């Protein structure tokens, strides 16, 4: 069966260039155009261009000419897209697609995340957030890590109810993530509630107990 297999997550300097791969397996690789699609949050889906691996003939969205370069390797059943002079704009998930025959896209790849930033790996600081001094709401702030992700639980993940972990946001080059847990005002301070934060990238694993002020 037809399967498109993309390369892995990229993190690059601004000004650098990246090269994404897609291995097409299960069909006659050379007969079919391969499509490149950009998915930016807030920017929807954007068609980058296509390449016909047989002769390596290319069709670029006039948008991306000079930013994107398609190459095909027909011995490896692989298609590459190089993005040059990387910027913040190029941070996105990139898909390759194969059309069913020649137009609308039947088969997609899993995508490639490409993040472009001046940032270097930074372990987060973890701050316990306890109420100002019936039902009770506590929090955990994870400030200034990189790269994504971090993973956060409450009491080793054994408090799953009333929990809100919010998507991280970028501030001053780095990620900031918050979580809130809710319990019955009866159940806390009485029982220990801890927030557990892990950052495999820095090998950070930290536990912070929420204590009364």
């Amino acid at each position: 069966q037809v399967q498109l297999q993309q390369s892995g997550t990229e993190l690059k300097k601004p000004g650098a260039s990246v090269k994404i791969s897609c291995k097409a397996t299960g069909y006659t690789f050379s007969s079919y155009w391969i499509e490149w699609i950009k998915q930016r949050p807030g920017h929807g889906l954007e068609w980058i261009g296509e390449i016909l691996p047989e002769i390596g003939m290319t069709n670029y969205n006039e948008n991306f000419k000079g930013k994107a370069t398609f190459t095909a390797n027909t011995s490896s059943n692989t298609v590459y897209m190089q993005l040059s002079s990387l910027t913040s704009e190029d941070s996105a998930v990139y898909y390759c697609a194969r059309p069913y025959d020649y137009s609308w896209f039947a088969y997609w790849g899993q995508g490639t995340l490409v993040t472009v930033s001046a940032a270097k790996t930074t372990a987060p600081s973890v701050y316990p957030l306890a109420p100002v001094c019936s039902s009770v709401t506590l929090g955990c702030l994870v400030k200034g890590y990189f790269p994504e992700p971090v993973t956060l639980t409450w009491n080793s993940g054994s408090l799953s109810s009333g929990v809100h972990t919010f998507p991280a946001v970028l501030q001053s080059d780095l990620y900031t993530l918050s979580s809130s847990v809710t319990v019955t005002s009866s159940t806390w301070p009485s029982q220990s509630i801890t927030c557990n934060v892990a950052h495999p990238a820095s090998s950070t694993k930290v536990d912070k107990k929420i204590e009364p002020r």
Binding site: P128, V132, T182
Partner: protein, 213 residues
């Protein structure tokens, strides 16, 4: 270039109902139009092509239609796994273009946000920084706005906002706002209040604290 316009970026539906996603082409694309579905953190999937034709591996709830430049994606007996963003694409002329995308959500009764204000941890203050955290939880509909007032004086400077996707279990929304600043200008002032303007309230809901206690 051909502009695919999806008027509705959000659509409020519920299970066992029909929902119609609308797309218009800025020129004649004929019937060369396709529809894709995408769910958070997953590759797109082909639903419809040549505007009315269902691709294999797609539920009977999805159907395409066209009249002139007007293209409709229709979902009947709408289900939870149908909640996703829907894109239309024209393949009529190059470059291929996509609509803006439409996100399905499940409608429910409104709720005022549950709002909590957290002063900077002693940990954070001891490291040299200040962050004031305002949580607005389990509200509806998703649209909401947050103001920060320092001693009554509004501050838009240095606020970090984050939103959860619609809650899959209770179908509400929640967001977090972190007012960040330098410990100096923090220990300079006294009252810290965050106000929330949302649909369910006449008077903005406002949570505050004064520094020392």
């Amino acid at each position: 270039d051909i502009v695919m316009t999806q008027s509705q970026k959000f659509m409020s539906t519920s299970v066992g109902d029909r929902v119609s996603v609308t797309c218009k082409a800025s020129q004649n694309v004929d019937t060369n139009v396709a529809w894709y579905q995408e769910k958070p953190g997953q590759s797109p999937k082909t639903l419809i092509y040549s505007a009315s034709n269902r691709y294999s591996g797609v539920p009977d709830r999805f159907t395409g239609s066209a009249s002139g430049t007007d293209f409709t994606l229709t979902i009947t007996n709408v289900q939870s796994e149908d909640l996703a963003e829907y894109f239309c694409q024209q393949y009529n002329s190059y470059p291929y273009t996509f609509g803006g995308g439409t996100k399905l959500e499940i409608k429910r009764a409104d709720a005022a946000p549950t709002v909590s204000i957290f002063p900077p941890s002693s940990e954070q203050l001891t490291s040299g920084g200040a962050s004031v955290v305002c949580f607005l939880n389990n509200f509806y509909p998703k649209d909401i706005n947050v103001k920060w007032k320092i001693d009554g004086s509004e501050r838009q400077n240095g606020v970090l906002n984050s939103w959860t996707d619609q809650d899959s279990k209770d179908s509400t929304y929640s967001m977090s706002s972190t007012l960040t600043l330098t410990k100096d200008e923090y220990e300079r002032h006294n009252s810290y209040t965050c106000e929330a303007t949302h649909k369910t309230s006449t008077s903005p809901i406002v949570k505050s604290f004064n520094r020392n206690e």
